[PDB]
Every structure is written in C-alpha cells, then in structure tokens.
Symmetry: C3
Subunit: 108 residues, 3 copies
Amino acid sequence: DIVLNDLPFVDGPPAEGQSRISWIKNGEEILGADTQYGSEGSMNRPTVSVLRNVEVLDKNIGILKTSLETANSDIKTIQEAGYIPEAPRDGQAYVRKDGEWVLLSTFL
Amino acid sequence: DIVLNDLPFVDGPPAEGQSRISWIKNGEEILGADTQYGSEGSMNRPTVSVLRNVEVLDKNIGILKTSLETANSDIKTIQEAGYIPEAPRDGQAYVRKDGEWVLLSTFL
Amino acid sequence: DIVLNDLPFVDGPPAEGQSRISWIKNGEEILGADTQYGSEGSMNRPTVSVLRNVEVLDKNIGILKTSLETANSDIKTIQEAGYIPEAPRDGQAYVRKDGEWVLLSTFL
C-alpha cells in the first residue's frame, strides 16, 4: 500500500494533523516581513500556507515516482524472463524443443 | 486510459471548464474577509484561486495512486503465477518433471 | 528512469535552476497590476511564484500519468500472452495437450 502525506493546510474544518488556513481579515494589521528572507506578516500568511501544501505535493509525487520506477523494473524483469506461451490445442501432445512446441508423435 | 481533472484557474486564456485568475489591480479596493473563516476580499482572491488548483492536484495524485496500487497488485499476481521458463535450445526434446526440464530420451 | 522538473521557486537557499521566493517586505511599495490581465505588483508577487510551482507540478503529474499508462498497457499484454503455469511436482513427466498438463506415461 502506498502511503502519502496529507496536506497540512485546508480551507475548511481540519482533520488530524491539519490546520485551517487563516485568510487576511479586515480590521487586521496589514504587514509584511522585516528581513530580506523572512515570510512573516499577514500579507504573506495565506500564500505561505499554500506553499507549504505545494511542498507536500512535490514530496508525494516523488513517492509515486519511486514506486512507479520499481513497477517498471519489475515489468522489464517479467518481459525478459523468457516464459513460454501455450501449445496448439488440437488434441495432440507436445514437447519442447529449440524454443518451439513439437509433436510428441514425431519421436514415438 | 487515466482521466485527470484539468486545473480550474489559469494565468492566461482559459480553455473549456477553466477560468482566468484575477490578479490584484491598482485602483481596486484592497479588502480582506469579514468573518473568522471567510476568504472574500481582493487581498485573498488570487491566493484562493491558486489553492483551488492545489486541491485539484491533490485529487489527481490520489487518482494516480489508486491506479498504481492496482498495477502493483497485478504485477504481484504475475510473479506468483508460477509461469515456466524456456527449456534448453540444444536440439533435444524436453518434458516437464518436478519443476525442471528433463530429456524426453531418458524415458524412451 | 523517470525525469521530473524541479520546482522553480523555493522558500530557502536555491539549488541549480531555482530562485528564492521574494515575500512582501515592510517598507516596500504595496502595488498591484496596471492591466486587466497582468500579474505585476508586490501584492501579487509571491502568489505568482507559487502558481509557477503549481504549473510545474501539473506537468510532472502528466509525466507520471504517461508512464503509468504505458505500464498498464505492458501488464495487459503479459496477462494476454497465454503463458503456461507449472505442472504437478509428483515425480512424473508431463507433456502439453489441449491447454493442460498430461502424463507422458499415457502415451508410452
């Protein structure tokens, strides 16, 4: 079973491990960040929350990619195993010789 | 064929079922929400649109996960089927005995 | 091997091909766009960056979908190949007739 991460922020009642996004409200102080790299401030808040979800989605795609790569590899192994197909269904018995089905009667 | 959902909001001319994102414009009233949980207001508008796309992406990943789980299960079934590999290609006829290829001549 | 696109914008030190997101800063001019369809302006900047990541994620999911469709098709081909299962492991030699394993002794 493949286990993916739940999104950390939702626009509605949260479930286990999630938080509700806090949109910008009127009457709230409209501020930005105080450092060249910080993300604090109400003006940035909801976008920071959406980016956190985007980071989780990126990791979930990486989990699916790894699993798909494994499937592709397993498929290639089956294709190269050299399994043999069915023999004619004509009421005659067949044996295997040189990669083909040959009539048993030919040897009796 | 796997059918995924198209993103609902795009930053360009929309196609069927899509809407163009409306960025914040100068000369527009800069407002937020009036409830503790609402997302109304120009200051929230473009971010709400991007979150809608994020919700759709999350569902699309869930669709791929289900399909991949089914593939993994089908692969496991093939690996456990016990298909048999090719017999030597040496000009001799072979029959099956105790999970191996044995020379027909040994019984004639 | 499946090759996916890296996200173009990150909230931290960037790696090859990435740029650091520029959050809204205090002391910065708070502006929007001047056209009905433009996305310029500090108020839109971080959200535009997150949308660029969302567009890349959408393409990465499309890459995984194509690869999974190919796997599904390869699996279907293996299921329809008609490979044959193992014969009884009871110390007796078997030959193939009418889609079943039959005792060689029956023909000797």
